[PDB]
Amino acid sequence: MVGLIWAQATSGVIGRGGDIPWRLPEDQAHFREITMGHTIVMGRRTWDSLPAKVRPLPGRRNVVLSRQADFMASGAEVVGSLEEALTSPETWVIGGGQVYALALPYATRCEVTEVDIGLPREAGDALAPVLDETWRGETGEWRFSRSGLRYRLYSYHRS
């Protein structure tokens, strides 16, 4: 089982300038709840994006995908291919617009957070993968974050 998890603006933007372009404090706990105790896979840039005090993410086996055989990632496992990263029975791909695209075909689950923020795509932004009709989903109820942004959770699956 390979699952993807991300938070996106309605527009599909998930990253800009190397950061997540919004504040949603409730996201951290939902992300934790889903990923805790599992192996997590991320692209090198997502690893770099993680604050130094929080990486590697605690309670999870951190796997970082990189083309540099010499890449240094303390507390994480650096691999050079997707096949080497997906060996666990339950793996969660936590990032990179690139890595989500790469891992989507191996996936049978997607946990998505839609952020109701006006943020049109700009050239160079990290974008979420598009889910075609092979996916079946359930949309949760919109809620208000204390940051003032409205958001909702989606759960998709396919066999």
Ligand X SMILES: NC(=O)C1=CN([C@@H]2O[C@H](COP(=O)(O)OP(=O)(O)OC[C@H]3O[C@@H](n4cnc5c(N)ncnc54)[C@H](OP(=O)(O)O)[C@@H]3O)[C@@H](O)[C@H]2O)C=CC1
Residues near ligand TOP (CB under 6 A): 5-7, 20, 27-28, 31, 46, 49-50, 54, 94-95, 113
Is 124 known to sit in a ligand binding site? Answer: no
Question: Which among 32-40, 61-69, 137-145, 150-158 is the span making contact with ligand X, rule CB under 6 A?
Answer: 61-69
- The C-alpha atoms of residue 25 and residue 148 are separated, in whole angstroms, by 11
41, interface contact from ligand X, ligand TOP, none, CB < 5-8 Å by kind: none
Nearer to ligand X, 70 or 132 (CB): 70
Find which of ligand X, ligand TOP, none residue 14 binds, CB within 5 to 8 Å per kind.
Answer: ligand X
One residue of 11, 98, 108, 145 binding ligand X per CB under 6 A? 98
Residue 63 partner contact from ligand X, ligand TOP, none using kind-dependent CB cut-offs of 5 to 8 Å? none
Pick from ligand X, ligand TOP, none: which does 28 bind, CB < 5 to 8 A by kind? ligand TOP
Nearest to 94 by CA among 11, 27, 23, 157: 27
Measured CA to CA, the distance from residue 113 to residue 6 in angstroms comes to: 6
With CB atoms as reference, the residue minimizing the distance to ligand X is 96
- Other Cβ atoms less than 10 A from the Cβ of 111: the count is 20
Backbone angles phi, psi at 42, to 5 degrees: -145, 155
Cα three-residue angle 153-158-159, rounded to 5 degrees: 150
Query: What CA–CA distance (Å, rounded) separates 38 from 89?
Result: 9
Per rule CB under 6 A, is residue 68 in the interface with ligand X?
A: yes
Local structure of residue 19 (DSSP, 8 states)? B
